Design a protein around this ligand. Structure first.
Ligand code: 6GP
Ligand code: 6GP
Ligand code: PLP
Ligand code: PLP
Lengths: 810, 810
């Protein structure tokens, strides 16, 4: 149908059809008379998968022959989403498969909706890992993603009575056609035990053993015939485990629980033993695999020349002491040489500055679970502090501030300090974030080793986030500038010469309208909810958290509602406000915010006077597959975190690339986005980081804003009086109390400027032509935010490898 | 190579080779450079599996079109063993696959050894179910085997320090290529809750739900293109299960534990809650599936005409009250009509008379777990006893003897009584066993309803137990009488006309020698143990149990050893005594018997004076695959259970068909085997059932035998003095105490006659020609013991269906 979706050759369509029927028969063991839609989905999945194998086998054989430096990206999260369409896009098989299934009397889009999301992540951090794998494959890097194969990913969110209900994400129920179990590479992981000091070296003995079984999933590059690997470990008990009889067998579950479920927290540290076990589990299995592959290429001096380990935050920080343990205890290298190798091999990426999100493990936990690692950590700390003492003689407070060991009620290990000490590079994920790291939380470290600190602004893959989810936009763009931009997003700048092109302006606006119509229909299909496609689609989708300030958005919504009730027959630009995102199960305030949102909708959506001028919808179960649907349909992107709290943000980039204008604070990547597009083409408002600091020094007093802003006072009084909760008048008392007495994120402080800015948005929307021209200016300057640019910088500035755009023989 | 293995056509060999390479590439994602033997095994398995699908799909379509009466065999055990070779045999692909793999540079036999046994059974009862499935498919019956897909089957037995060690049988570790998950047919099973009595009928409410997910495995008939199904249920927790968050997800294990492991008991009842849950789990899921299929053919009067349910012992006895529950509570049929349908639908097979093996569930357990079923059972009992009271007025003791409810310390439900009352047919598994049922334990029931009692002597499938495990013997036989006997075993009688044929006599003897050489080599390969292939192979393989009397065998072995030590330079026929079998983990005496056996071997195998004249080997981890190796190599089959205890026995039939002579008591099927072959061609000894009864009436006094038999006294003194356990003089004190004071199985009573009989065996072995002629007479008369004969009788006399030998279009 459309150009960017590839060719539908006669030979290929014929081949696809026969292989489809072959799998339906031999693989699914079914006939066209009893086959269900799910059966057809699997037949198609296996058919597409077949096209990957040849390339997958030769890519790996290629790396063996050339032996390039290997990149290992360690993460406890890989938010992959669905794999079928992405695979077709990267293999240029979309139109062929669409035609083939069409001829078989099937609708491919219907089949794609059957695939379960691989939701092995919470949000931004996990999705970044997924985008990175795509880019590393597209740039021809010998990269491997290593993680855990959770039996249950992020929970499926259900809304009952306006409240969030959690249900298990049994994503493997019907099977996973993309993965390939590799039991032959199963490795042992040790826990507990004790340390024994012998004549020659220490020994970790009397440990409990848990097996790590790997499952490999192919990661295809964009049309370059490269297929890398994502290896996820699954926990298995040894067969002699606990070996009355029956109980011993049933207790195998204890060991296998390690890979059972993903901790559902976004930007929040929960110091539970099971989580620590998961972190060591992935690190121990991965490092053995890395060393095994290295030897199969004694001379560990060349280890850093053949290996690069990237730590996605501190979750896999134990890789540092584990590498030391192996090199020192097992390989018998002297400490100094081992440390040199470790530092040159490891690099650390920080993803937040919120104190509650930093990992600080209790010493008593490490002491019992990983006794040898604790000893190695104390030794690392000892030698590191000796270096600090030599550089800053007499500065005793600096010593206690930089220590990896934190004193107090209970001693803890600051994992971030461990990562900085044992890594040759430390980076933030957006310019402002990286600067904050050097100026605040990591200031002492920056002063000791300035060369270690870098910035690597985040990005998103234009394959999944443009071509896959918005083919209509990808097509009108390709029509003007070709298809080269898909793997060289900077070329979108050429669109700047079409900002005055009446034809282009019309096409851009038409694509958006079509996306909105499609999404508007979807809402009624799977969720039975009516919305006016002519209204401005105002959306804020991301995990629910106080720092992201969904509450500020709520305040604006209520303001709009009160204004309409005050002057009913006054014209206002129609809006459909959409808010979606999951709240961590144990995050009470976050769950209350969800209830507030649905409560507001209950009132606003049923008020006769409002009509179709204002609608408030809460998008249930926001996940990757849902993002691919709502983002292309958005007009306004809400990125309103308090300045200095959102390290980078990536959802913001997805909206910019898909034709939505942005209203937001100068926080995270928003700053660079506005810089690229021009501040006049962005809706910036609120306090800057400096303004927040000034307020804190003076003391934030929410009462002041309440006393001086009549409209704000009214909203708070409505909340307190039960206006939004008739049967439960004090239902939102906790929210009001927090806002009024202990709001760490200063919601009230940005209220006035936010509302004013929103009026400017409605003003521009009333002028279709000018709204679209500003949109074009945003799309045209979103090139910098491609994860291909991000990965190329990591490759050259951190890993020491050169990216390649060369195709491999298919 | 050999005739009976089929043709190796050029076209087929070429096709097999290409499909083998296809699966290695696309299915296993590997190349010939990194493929391991396990990889090659799977490539072959998938290749053979492909040949089954077409036939499997059309067989099921066939049953849908013709709608014949369906046979449902319910069992908690299906001891299948390996599937690859069996599939090739039934599809006549063995030589083709052998040639194809040969050309690819691979040894098929080596690949077959890689497959894990599907050990979902304990012994005889579970293997009978497996043989039955094979025969039902070969006889063209629309049969379905229903059971549980245990994650862990019978434990793998390891021998350490002469003691049995148990280790988990993780048979699904590398995957199961034969099964096909059918999540689309997942069904709910209810537990706990309470009964609510409403205006119209009772309702079972507030129950906990566990999902039953089916996995289908194909069951090919012998060269008739019929492929039936074995459906095994797997337990799955619902997604809203227990829905802090993490714990709720981890607790899903509680529900899924139902299908986690097989209870490892042979002829022993263990009243644990988990076992009861397994029994109801299989019954509830299966019955819903049966009824669903029935409706997809309201008129339950025709239910018995379209459905037959065979209960393999009482394990699935809850099918009776569950069927009543569904018909009465859900379908709204009146009790009397529902009962009529239930009785006409169900049939029960008893497999033992040992009191400790009978199921008697505590009322308090059923009361809590299945409240509605308990009520239905009380009602059934009430109406049944009313019938008894009317037939035998005033006989109050008969009423208490026949009640389904047993009074006493704790009230229990006698499941056997439940089965007899709710079944239209009850059968024993050997003529003598069925007679004992009518004369003793079920006497009262037989007097009330004589027409219900039948006999169906057991059998074994000649496919796995002759053609598959002993191709050499199958070939020399086919050379003389053709291949028709493989599916019409009675034709072996034609071999009687070759008993004087010098050529045949030589071939029979040659095949046995080759089998012994192969097995003798195997022992050194995987177990490093030397044995003299020229000796008589004396073997007893079966589960370890006191009633099977492995101890009597031990006494004979020690006798032989003492005699040699007494007259060292006297000639004796060399023997290799092999004993193997697993002991239930909680069966202490059984574990002590294993230790005694290895202890005897430790002494006998290292005595210089004995030389290679006597060897005692304990065959580790006896299972189906091992049986296929040792049985064809045996000369003497030990079937020495105390008369009246072995219901039938089936191992005895396997040995008879494979050229071994039998030494045994007139117990179980041994009686019919001797009757078929002629008592002069069997080595019978010991007390008959009548003799055992006389002894019990008089009182068994073991001391008497000890006082009057010098050789026996010596053995007991050696055991007591520590002769076989130097470091632990009283190690076998429990064994001696049991033998001397509380031996329920009268080991001593048959000692003298057993030893005398064994001398007659050694005498015949010294005459090769006559030994072989007697062997021929046994093989020639083993036809009656084919499970095809057994199934044909069940079909005509119980299920009301006619077996068919007609091929289906392939
Ligand atoms: C440990 O931090 C987190 O939980 C987390 O998800 N952080 C997130 O990581 C993303 C990728 O760098 C950033 O864009 C987000 O701003 C940051 O909050
Ligand atoms: C519940 O009984 C058992 O545990 C069991 O395995 N019984 C066995 O069943 C076999 C098949 O009929 C018979 O041949 C054996 O003699 C009987 O002991
Ligand atoms: C892109 C993405 C995120 C990150 O969004 P931010 O607004 O940067 O927090 C979270 N969840 C999903 C499903 C995403 O696709
Ligand atoms: C045939 C068989 C049995 C039954 O043997 P009996 O001697 O009748 O108890 C038990 N186990 C296995 C593995 C078998 O093949």
């Amino acid at each position: 149908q459309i150009s960017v979706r590839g060719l539908a050759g006669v030979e290929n369509v014929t081949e696809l059809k026969k292989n489809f029927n072959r799998h339906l028969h031999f693989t699914l063991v079914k006939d066209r008379n009893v086959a269900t839609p799910r059966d057809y989905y699997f037949a198609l999945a296996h058919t597409v998968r077949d096209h990957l194998v040849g390339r997958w086998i030769r890519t790996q054989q290629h790396y063996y022959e050339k032996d390039p430096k290997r990149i290992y990206y360690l993460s406890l999260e890989f938010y992959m989403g669905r794999t079928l369409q992405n695979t077709m896009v990267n293999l240029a098989l979309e139109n062929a498969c669409d035609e083939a299934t069409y001829q078989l009397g099937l609708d491919m889009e219907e089949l794609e909706e059957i695939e379960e999301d691989a939701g092995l992540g919470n949000g931004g951090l996990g999705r970044l890992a997924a985008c990175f794998l795509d880019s590393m494959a597209t740039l021809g890097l010998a990269a491997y993603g290593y993680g855990i194969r959770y039996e249950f990913g992020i929970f499926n969110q259900k809304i009952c009575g306006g409240w969030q209900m959690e249900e298990a994400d049994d994503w493997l129920r019907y099977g996973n056609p993309w993965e390939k179990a590799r039991p032959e590479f199963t490795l042992p992981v040790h826990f507990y035990g004790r340390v024994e000091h012998t004549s020659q070296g220490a020994k970790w003995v009397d440990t409990q053993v848990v097996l790590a079984m790997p499952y490999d999933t192919p990661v295809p590059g964009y049309r370059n015939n490269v297929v890398n690997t994502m290896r996820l470990w699954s926990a298995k008990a040894p067969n002699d485990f606990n070996l009355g009889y029956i109980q011993a067998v049933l207790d195998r579950n204890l060991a296998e629980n390690i890979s059972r479920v993903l901790y559902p927290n976004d930007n929040f540290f929960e110091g539970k033993e099971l989580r620590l076990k998961q972190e060591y589990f992935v690190v121990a299995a991965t490092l053995q695999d890395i060393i095994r592959r290295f030897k199969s290429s004694t001379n560990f001096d060349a280890f850093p020349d053949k290996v690069a380990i990237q730590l996605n935050d501190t979750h896999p920080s134990l890789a540092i002491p584990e590498l030391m343990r192996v090199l020192v205890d097992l390989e018998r290298l002297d400490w100094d040489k081992a440390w040199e190798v470790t530092v040159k091999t490891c690099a650390y990426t920080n993803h937040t500055v919120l104190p509650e999100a930093l990992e600080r493990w209790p010493v008593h936990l490490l002491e019992t679970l990983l006794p040898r690692h604790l000893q190695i950590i104390y030794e690392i700390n000892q030698r590191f502090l000796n270096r600090v003492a030599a550089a800053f003689p007499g500065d005793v407070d600096r010593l206690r501030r930089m220590s990896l060991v934190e004193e107090g009620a209970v001693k803890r290990i600051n994992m971030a300090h461990l990562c900085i000490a044992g890594s040759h590079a430390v980076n933030g994920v957006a310019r402002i974030h990286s600067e904050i790291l050097k100026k605040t939380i990591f200031k002492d470290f920056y002063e000791l080793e300035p060369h270690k600190f870098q910035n690597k602004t985040n990005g998103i893959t234009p394959r999944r986030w443009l071509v896959l989810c918005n083919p209509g936009l990808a097509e009108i763009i390709a029509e003007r500038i070709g298809e080269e931009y898909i793997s060289d997003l900077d070329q979108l700048r050429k669109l700047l010469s079409y900002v005055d092109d009446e034809a282009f302006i019309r096409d851009v606006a038409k694509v958006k309208q079509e996306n909105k119509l499609k999404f508007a229909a979807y809402l009624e299909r799977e969720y039975k909810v009516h919305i006016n496609p002519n209204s401005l689609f105002d959306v804020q989708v991301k995990r629910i958290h106080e720092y992201k300030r969904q509450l500020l958005n709520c305040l604006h919504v209520i303001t709009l509602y009160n204004r309409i009730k005050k002057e009913p027959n006054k014209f206002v630009v129609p809006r459909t406000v959409m808010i979606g995102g999951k709240a961590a199960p144990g995050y009470h305030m976050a769950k209350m915010i969800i209830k507030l949102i649905t409560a507001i909708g209950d009132v606003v959506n049923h008020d006769p006077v409002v009509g179709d001028r204002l609608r408030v919808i809460f998008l249930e179960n926001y996940r990757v597959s849902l993002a691919e649907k709502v983002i292309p349909a958005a007009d306004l992107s809400e990125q309103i975190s308090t300045a200095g709290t959102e390290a980078s943000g990536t959802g913001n980039m997805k909206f910019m690339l898909n034709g939505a204008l942005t209203i937001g604070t100068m926080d995270g990547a928003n700053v660079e986005m506005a810089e690229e597009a021009g501040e006049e083409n962005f809706f910036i408002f609120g306090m800057r980081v400096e303004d927040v600091d000034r307020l804190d020094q003076r003391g934030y007093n929410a009462q002041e804003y309440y006393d001086r802003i009549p409209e704000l006072r009214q909203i708070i009084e409505q909340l307190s009086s039960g206006f939004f909760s008739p049967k439960q008048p004090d239902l939102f008392k906790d929210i009001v109390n927090m806002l009024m007495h202990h709001d760490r994120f200063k919601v009230f402080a940005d209220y006035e400027e936010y509302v004013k800015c929103q009026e400017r948005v409605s003003a521009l929307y009333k002028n279709p032509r000018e709204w679209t021209r500003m949109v074009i200016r945003n799309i045209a300057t979103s090139g910098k935010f491609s994860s291909d640019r991000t990965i190329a910088q990591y490759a050259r500035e951190i890993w020491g490898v050169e990216p390649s755009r060369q195709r491999l023989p298919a």
